[PDB]
Amino acid sequence: ALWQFNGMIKCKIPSSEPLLDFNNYGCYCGLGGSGTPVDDLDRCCQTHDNCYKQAKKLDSCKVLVDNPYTNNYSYSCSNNEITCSSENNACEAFICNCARNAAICFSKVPYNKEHKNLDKKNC
């Protein structure tokens, strides 16, 4: 959910405050997302946006009726490695994977400050 995602990013990027650094970045990092991603990090966010959107259409999440920020799945972080919990059911596990993928993606791409707080005209 939101706090787990934030903790997962920190796990991979220990010097960051993801709620400050990765919010409002490019066209997809933060509320909504549309247009063409401005860079690779923006693509990470785009992918993660699509993943949560896919989660919602899942039979398992739908047999229940969650919210990608109301789902208390479990994960751990050891040595900057994120492990989604075996205990997570199919829905929780799919969402946790979306987040773990996003976090690793964030840790693998350049950060371009010029793209921080981008006017959505460019999207």
Q: Which is nearer to Ca ion, 10 or 43 (CB)?
A: 43
Q: Encoding tokens for residue 106? A: 């964030």
Look at the block and give the residue holding tokens 């247009």: 35
Q: Which is nearer to Ca ion, 24 or 76 (CB)?
A: 24
Residue 76 main-chain phi, psi, to 5 deg:
-140, 165
CB of 87 to Ca ion, least distance (A): 28
* Separation of alpha carbons 95 and 123, rounded Å: 26
CB of 45 to Ca ion, least distance (A): 5
CB of 26 to Ca ion, least distance (A): 9
Sign, CA dihedral 57-59-62-66, equals negative
Cβ proximity of 4 and 84 under 8 Å: no
Count other C-beta atoms under 10 Å from residue 95's C-beta.
27
Q: Which is nearer to Ca ion, 70 or 78 (CB)?
A: 70
Q: Which is nearer to Ca ion, 90 or 109 (CB)?
A: 109
CB of 39 to Ca ion, least distance (A): 14
Contact residues toward Ca ion (CB under 5 A) are 28, 33, 49
Give the residue closest to Ca ion by C-beta.
33
